[PDB]
Amino acid sequence: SHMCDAFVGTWKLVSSENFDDYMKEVGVGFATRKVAGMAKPNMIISVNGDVITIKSESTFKNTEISFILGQEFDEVTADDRKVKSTITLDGGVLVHVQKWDGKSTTIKRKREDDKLVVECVMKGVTSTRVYERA
Numbered sequence: 702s703h704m705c706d707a708f709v710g711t712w713k714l715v716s717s718e719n720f721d722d723y724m725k726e727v728g729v730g731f732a733t734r735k736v737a738g739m740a741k742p743n744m745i746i747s748v749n750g751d752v753i754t755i756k757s758e759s760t761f762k763n764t765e766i767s768f769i770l771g772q773e774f775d776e777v778t779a780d781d782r783k784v785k786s787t788i789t790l791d792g793g794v795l796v797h798v799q800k801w802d803g804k805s806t807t808i809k810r811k812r813e814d815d816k817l818v819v820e821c822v823m824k825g826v827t828s829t830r831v832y833e834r835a
């Protein structure tokens with residue numbers, strides 16, 4: 702419903718900040734942290750009706766989620782967590798909460814200028830991933 706018009710398309714990762722400390726906070730093990738930290742994924746976003754699809758294409762992994770805003774779904778993350786995810790819109794920001802093993806992390810996706818900025822927070826620790834159009 703014109704839901705994500707400014708986000709639809711293909712985006713390539715151009716910069717990352719604080720990746721390692723965020724992944725440590727999440728509980729990701731050494732080898733996965735090191736290998737995952739090299740990746741420069743593309744993020745492919747599309748919308749069909751009420752269904753939003755976000756794919757990540759990478760040398761580390763490929764992942765895909767499809768969802769309806771507000772409606773919880775199962776997600777196996779790139780680091781192999783089995784989480785319950787709920788994604789909503791808050792003032793133009795896509796807010797994605799992942800719950801697993803009594804833990805929680807929040808991933809926010811927004812547009813700033815010609816960038817797509819992703820901010821992920823686990824307790825006090827934030828990582829920022831900046832994407833540009835591919």
Ligand SMILES: *Sc1ccccc1C(N)=O
Nearest residue numbers: 704705708793794795810
């Ligand atoms: S609708 C959408 C889809 C993907 C990333 C971000 C957003 C958003 N902030 O509206």
Ligand SMILES: *Sc1ccccc1C(N)=O
Nearest residue numbers: 720808819820821828830
């Ligand atoms: S924001 C972030 C940072 C580090 C790993 C993964 C992510 C993400 N879910 O986009």
